[PDB]
Design a protein around this ligand. Structure first.
Ligand SMILES: *[C@@H]1O[C@H](CO)[C@@H](O[C@@H]2O[C@H](CO)[C@@H](O[C@@H]3O[C@H](CO[C@H]4O[C@H](CO)[C@@H](O)[C@H](O)[C@@H]4O)[C@@H](O)[C@H](O[C@H]4O[C@H](CO)[C@@H](O)[C@H](O)[C@@H]4O)[C@@H]3O)[C@H](O)[C@H]2NC(C)=O)[C@H](O)[C@H]1NC(C)=O
Ligand SMILES: *[C@@H]1O[C@H](CO)[C@@H](O[C@@H]2O[C@H](CO)[C@@H](O[C@@H]3O[C@H](CO[C@H]4O[C@H](CO)[C@@H](O)[C@H](O)[C@@H]4O)[C@@H](O)[C@H](O[C@H]4O[C@H](CO)[C@@H](O)[C@H](O)[C@@H]4O)[C@@H]3O)[C@H](O)[C@H]2NC(C)=O)[C@H](O)[C@H]1NC(C)=O
Ligand SMILES: *C1O[C@H](CO)[C@@H](O[C@@H]2O[C@H](CO)[C@@H](O[C@@H]3O[C@H](CO)[C@@H](O)[C@H](O)[C@@H]3O)[C@H](O)[C@H]2NC(C)=O)[C@H](O)[C@H]1NC(C)=O
Ligand SMILES: *C1O[C@H](CO)[C@@H](O[C@@H]2O[C@H](CO)[C@@H](O[C@@H]3O[C@H](CO)[C@@H](O)[C@H](O)[C@@H]3O)[C@H](O)[C@H]2NC(C)=O)[C@H](O)[C@H]1NC(C)=O
Ligand SMILES: CCC(CC)O[C@@H]1C=C(C(=O)O)C[C@H](N)[C@H]1NC(C)=O
Ligand SMILES: CCC(CC)O[C@@H]1C=C(C(=O)O)C[C@H](N)[C@H]1NC(C)=O
Ligand SMILES: CCC(CC)O[C@@H]1C=C(C(=O)O)C[C@H](N)[C@H]1NC(C)=O
Ligand SMILES: CCC(CC)O[C@@H]1C=C(C(=O)O)C[C@H](N)[C@H]1NC(C)=O
Ligand SMILES: *[C@@H]1O[C@H](CO)[C@@H](O)[C@H](O)[C@H]1NC(C)=O
Ligand SMILES: *[C@@H]1O[C@H](CO)[C@@H](O)[C@H](O)[C@H]1NC(C)=O
Ligand SMILES: *[C@H]1O[C@H](CO)[C@@H](O)[C@H](O)[C@H]1NC(C)=O
Ligand SMILES: *[C@H]1O[C@H](CO)[C@@H](O)[C@H](O)[C@H]1NC(C)=O
Ligand SMILES: [Ca+2]
Ligand SMILES: [Ca+2]
Ligand SMILES: [Ca+2]
Ligand SMILES: [Ca+2]
Lengths: 390, 390, 390, 390
């Protein structure tokens, strides 16, 4: 019989390495006979036995004749799909969980919870599934596009925690946290602090008592807002990441934002979902982050790390760990997830690599995975190997 | 070991919402590489661990060369098929249960029961299959196209109840109920009351004591015949629904059929199978129905609910719960099924959205899913997104 | 924990009915995107939990460019493949058990045994697999094409019995029986009686003590040789089926072979594998057989039945049960198999329907299934629905 | 719960026979609708319930547009993949374990261990994965293409032994052995003796005490270096095989290398990985090897055996056990693996049959399987049946 699940100490290791590429569109050419789903916003969640690869499909394959509109975001056809990690997400392999143009998922130890937001922009609806059953919803509270993590949610003792948000992308977007248990919302958590704009949060456990998320401010700053959730007291505070190594895109030169830690600075309009995962140690806490190689475009992806301290107060640059994606390749969304080993947890970062040929062709993505493994320096970058002309 | 299942209290919730679209022909294009089966009359039936998506195929794929005939109903090629709900029903994903040009299925908590009618129009044969084995048959009794539900049948305590009917579709078709147990028919129940013409009943549990069916008079009325089946005494009775919200298609204007409740009215000729599903609470029962948005065409699909009362006597209009399919998309057969959550049941409605381009091109169908979830109003509607020309 | 398996009493029923068609080539057209394996000699075997559909593929799909040679029999590419019954045997769905141009399989209650013969004609080799492991072989003893049942073998108390044979197709072919236990040959059984030519035997249990097979004489008679295996004493006798209803193809007019029961008669050169399954009752034994509608070509397929008596001595015509395949459709190999219901066994007959366009096109087959179900007369025939020009 | 596995006595048997052909490119034609992966360096590794078929893909299918590069070895796209043995390794059937341009895997009785080396030629990285989790890494030690077995590694009592090597392939490559446990490297074993150049060892258990490896000197000899690894003391020693039946390709004429056993000889430059597998009896051990039928080209594959004796000292020619691939078909890499039967182990040899049409067309491979089964001589040989022009 299955127990609830808890964050365990991390596995030993001092560096990340290239783990695995999932590039479906290597098989999307017209010469071929394969049918990979057009997707975006991939993310991964692992339970005690499998890891699932999730995405939002446009309900189209390549090749096909429904490309037109695949470079949009919300519509009545977007679905949350998954396959077992390491399987190519195709028409036959994928499972379609629910209609949703925004999503999340997480395993509590007994069951999968699936999260999908759909509906009209002025009144969207967060839906929840526990296994195969629809169990609860949540309503827009700002009437300006309710949306969620695009990342794994996080469960502890059967309590699953989920960031949601609502409000103008180019203005105020106050996020809330949901406390979900066996598919049903049992508490809403309103953060305090710097709440102006928080979205597309990437959250993991820093401890058995705290969740941390690095988030996106699409409006005011290239600093990432940084949430701290206290799971023992069901309360949350958000302050900007003080680090000179600004993690959003677009962004100014590192350390060029003058003033106190909460200062917004410039080139802070727009943003990108960023990767963040915890290395939990006995007397240490490892914080691993990812950001675009370009300060302006979605190209390349870098790995950064900082042990200990307070991300709210420390202005120190993050340590640069290595190049995961070269600047000559697309570097879009990235996310954190952990694989459950037998006795310990393995932290990993995934990378969405979008094939963008403009609005006059199909628009989709591959997923690069990096994971904490062994000692040394990160050794090799990743390429999609896709030529969109085929 | 497993035990027999019984209807449970429904899960908490106040409105339906868009769950899931299964739209195989989104990958049905010449430009592509997939092979979705040409099907019609879909329905869903869920068990303690799996929900299954059934349909009647024509034993052809799109694209393919065997379109001719796919706009017909009965032939030697038709087979009851299924995929796990959420999977695209393609040549490879599908499983072929039996030859059938009319079907049903249901889980008793121990095993799947599958039901398929095939054979000549003047001597059809209902076949029962329990798991992998074929176990019993029922004979035509009117020699006018013996036929069954096209929706999930209903199992309580190992006993599965099923509507069957036989007769001219422009005249009399007195239906019967079969009591099946572990694949074998143990009692025929002959309903009393308004028996002139019943078919394509959508049935579900109103309690541990009563099964209710909303049906189709293809001959005499636009009101749906409404079966109450007492499961304790194995007796059944039919009267027409009194509600001014007439549920068949075609139909006249709401509340325009004058006279006592049993009055047939104008626009009786013709019909369509309608969604019906139960919401079982503490000491009240909600009844959820679906009808096409057009009075005469198979376009659109609206949701309606009515808590309590006797459906044989309540002239009251049903409450309009929302638009599931717009008047600009096809709305064909609809059906009710329930999903099993950990401790309670989730009431759902499925809509068949047929792609119809005439007898000179392929003729298949998508399936839209709406389920009780959360509170509020029903928000978004469903399109199939299919271009029948691609 | 699993027990060994034994023949149980049959399920009640007095007639066969059309159960299920598996016609992969409905999806083989060039307009399509599917890839069904080119196969022949299909057969089915069921264990306590699933039923597997077996065949010998030419290691080619349709469409493709390896048709040339698919109208042959033995080569270094022929394999024994299977899928779960009701699944279309395609390149992806099928599993490849072993190289073999002749085969058999059966479940003992704990495990699958697979049988495949390959090698050169003058020295072929019978191979055995127990689950995934190759466990034993058997050698040609006549150097003239060692070959086997093309049908399910039969297990009792963990002992699986298998017909094999060797020798000229147009001359003498003395069959032997193998006693196999957990993948290894533990006894060879040499029949006595009329041993001149016995091949492609279709065997089932007539009792907990006897196996009966109806076989093919390709050389001397259109009567089917009829084996009786005694499982309590590991001994076997073969005599010709005395019945006027000659079951082989080609064949003379019924009852036209004058003389004693063992008389060969004419039109007895050549032959066809014929279907045969037992209806085991308390005080009765049902023997169900199938034979071509044509007396000369492989067209149509008929169902016959006789209760009780001695098939060695009785000259009475078999009772005609109905037309399974019309004479306007191909009727090639047929076979018997039983599905295990919960408390009882269900007898069924399968029919190989070859698409034969000559040697200048592909050459493959679909499988029609009929099964004992309910009372009355067999109601409907089967068609492949395939146009080989597509 | 499961327990650790140990080598068991082999099953009874005296000769190998043709088991199974996996030839994906039989469905690789333009005329068709399949998508087999372009792979090379296959190998098999079996566990207590499943046997897995591994390969290194180039992340492309046939037909497809990414042929260019598929005749190379190392690039960022290469991934270790697998299907259950008997399944066609296509885009949909496959699972992508990790990025790797050199690989291995093995089961300890509790879990799969997967091994993949990727990275720059001058700083490769071996990655260890235990089930779903990445668990450890090993670094280049010569900065000359760290690389591993390309065959199953070897687990006894939870300890998995693996050969790795690093060095110029036209010079020195002193190999090492890694002792892995539950994904983690717990000891490096540095072999003594003839260490000049070892690589691509094919390893297997000779007893509960000793692992034996037949390897490849790509530089100095056509004799195979032969590792004896004592598993009790974790020490290893290498000397060359003395047998006149030299096993590398290219090679000179048998018994033409004159001198003591350690003598290198002519035609040392170049090499190929060879099949090697153990047959463990009461108190004797058979050693089965494979070598290409041509002295200089990668054509054909023959089987050889030698019961007992010391392979470091036995000048005796090995007994020729048969032709598996004719001199008219490709014979590339070969490898040994064992299948687990109920109470004993089944020794097997796998052959890589590469389809080579030059650097201007696709470059992939089939896999032939031979296993110990029954007695006699080895009968039939294997073709792949592929036309590289289709
Ligand atoms: C239609 O009819 C069926 C059959 O009667 C009803 O199903 C039963 O529903 C009741 C609840 O109404 C169930 O009783 C409960 O069982 C709980 C344990 O879960 C399992 O229990 C056994 C094994 O322990 C299993 O065999 C079974 O399948 C259950 O899944 C108990 O924990 C509960 O007891 C607690 O609750 C109350 C106080 O709140 C008290 O009884 C106790 O003091 C205790 O605190 C509870 O008794 C019963 O198990 C169900 N049986 C079956 C076969 O399903 C349907 O509810 C009914 N539908 C209606 C009425 O709409
Ligand atoms: C390499 O090393 C391993 C570990 O020592 C050996 O594996 C053992 O092999 C022996 C046989 O040589 C096994 O002993 C036998 O166990 C049988 C039962 O099967 C299971 O037993 C237990 C549970 O009962 C399980 O834990 C285990 O995994 C087995 O699968 C017994 O029935 C046998 O006993 C009978 O046989 C003889 C007489 O013939 C007597 O011992 C008894 O009187 C009795 O009649 C038998 O003892 C042992 O279980 C194996 N262990 C493991 C962990 O696998 C390998 O054989 C060895 N390889 C070599 C030597 O080549
Ligand atoms: C916070 O989450 C739980 C809080 O209890 C921690 O998990 C638990 O960890 C303990 C020990 O780490 C486990 O207890 C036992 O440990 C002994 C060794 O002393 C061992 O022999 C037993 O077999 C047993 O495992 C306990 O089972 C485990 N529970 C679960 C559900 O995992 C967790 O480590 C904490 N997270 C941290 C510290 O980051
Ligand atoms: C020949 O095969 C076996 C020979 O024993 C028969 O199967 C066995 O049948 C008996 C009864 O049919 C089963 O015993 C028990 O029956 C009682 C009822 O009296 C029931 O309450 C028990 O639960 C139990 O089932 C026995 O279990 C069963 N064994 C197996 C392995 O199936 C079989 O019926 C014979 N075949 C014939 C007669 O055709
Ligand atoms: C809706 C606001 C938000 C910020 C602009 O848009 C996101 C940015 C997009 C992006 O930056 O690539 C992709 C996301 N799919 C989108 N989210 C939704 C719900 O549409
Ligand atoms: C045969 C009577 C019945 C009522 C008109 O026909 C149904 C009409 C249906 C319809 O109105 O679309 C299609 C159904 N598939 C068909 N059922 C059968 C068994 O043919
Ligand atoms: C080899 C003798 C036998 C009788 C002519 O041939 C069978 C007849 C063929 C047939 O009658 O259709 C098909 C069988 N695949 C074949 N068996 C083998 C092993 O090739
Ligand atoms: C790099 C040294 C080694 C020996 C020549 O190369 C091998 C030659 C092999 C060969 O001879 O065909 C192909 C192997 N895939 C390759 N291995 C790697 C890691 O590239
Ligand atoms: C459809 O089939 C009928 C016969 O069944 C045939 O007469 C008709 O021409 C076919 N239609 C087309 C468009 O080919
Ligand atoms: C293969 O790729 C190289 C560059 O990587 C390119 O120069 C060459 O032309 C390509 N070959 C073909 C046949 O296109
Ligand atoms: C698709 O783009 C076309 C241009 O090809 C444009 O006319 C239209 O806005 C879009 N239509 C749909 C259905 O997406
Ligand atoms: C296939 O048939 C061709 C004719 O197209 C003939 O030349 C030859 O005998 C056959 N070849 C193979 C490889 O089967
Ligand atoms: Ca920003
Ligand atoms: Ca009507
Ligand atoms: Ca004959
Ligand atoms: Ca050499």
């Amino acid at each position: 019989e299955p127990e609830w699940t808890y964050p365990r100490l991390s596995c030993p290791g001092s560096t990340f390495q290239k783990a695995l590429l999932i590039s479906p569109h290597r098989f999307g050419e017209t010469k071929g006979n394969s049918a990979p789903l057009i997707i975006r916003e991939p993310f991964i969640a692992c339970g005690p036995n499998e890891c699932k690869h999730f995405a939002l499909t446009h309900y189209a394959a390549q090749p096909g004749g429904y490309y037109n509109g695949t470079r949009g975001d919300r519509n009545k056809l977007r679905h949350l799909i998954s396959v077992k990690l390491g399987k190519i997400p195709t028409v036959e392999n994928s499972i379609f969980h629910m209609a949703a143009w925004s999503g999340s998922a997480c395993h509590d130890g007994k069951e999968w919870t699936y999260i999908g937001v759909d509906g009209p922009d002025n009144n969207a609806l967060l839906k929840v599934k526990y296994g195969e059953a629809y169990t609860d919803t949540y309503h827009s509270y700002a009437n300006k596009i309710l949306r969620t993590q695009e990342s794994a949610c996080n469960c502890i003792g059967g309590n699953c925690y989920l960031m949601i948000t609502d409000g103008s992308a180019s203005g105020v977007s106050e996020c809330r946290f949901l406390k979900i248990r066996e598919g049903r919302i049992i508490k809403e958590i309103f953060p305090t602090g710097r709440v102006k704009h928080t979205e597309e949060c990437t959250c993991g456990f820093a401890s058995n008592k705290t969740i941390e998320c690095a988030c996106r401010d699409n409006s005011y700053t290239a600093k990432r807002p940084f949430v701290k959730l206290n799971v023992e007291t069901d309360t949350a505070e958000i302050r900007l990441m003080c680090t000179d190594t600004y993690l959003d895109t677009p962004r100014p030169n590192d350390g060029s934002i003058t003033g106190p830690c909460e200062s917004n600075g410039d080139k802070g309009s727009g943003g990108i979902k960023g990767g963040f995962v915890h290395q939990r140690m006995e007397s240490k806490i490892g914080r691993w982050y990812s950001r675009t190689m370009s300060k302006t475009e979605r190209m390349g992806m870098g790995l950064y790390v900082k042990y200990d301290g307070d991300p709210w107060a420390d202005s120190d640059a993050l340590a640069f760990s290595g190049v995961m994606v070269s600047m000559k390749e697309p570097g879009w969304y990235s996310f954190g997830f952990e694989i459950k080993d037998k006795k310990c947890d393995v932290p990993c970062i995934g990378i969405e690599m979008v094939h963008d040929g403009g609005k006059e062709t199909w628009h989709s993505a591959a997923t690069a995975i990096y994971c904490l493994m062994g000692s040394g320096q990160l050794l090799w970058d990743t390429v999609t190997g896709v030529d969109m002309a085929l």
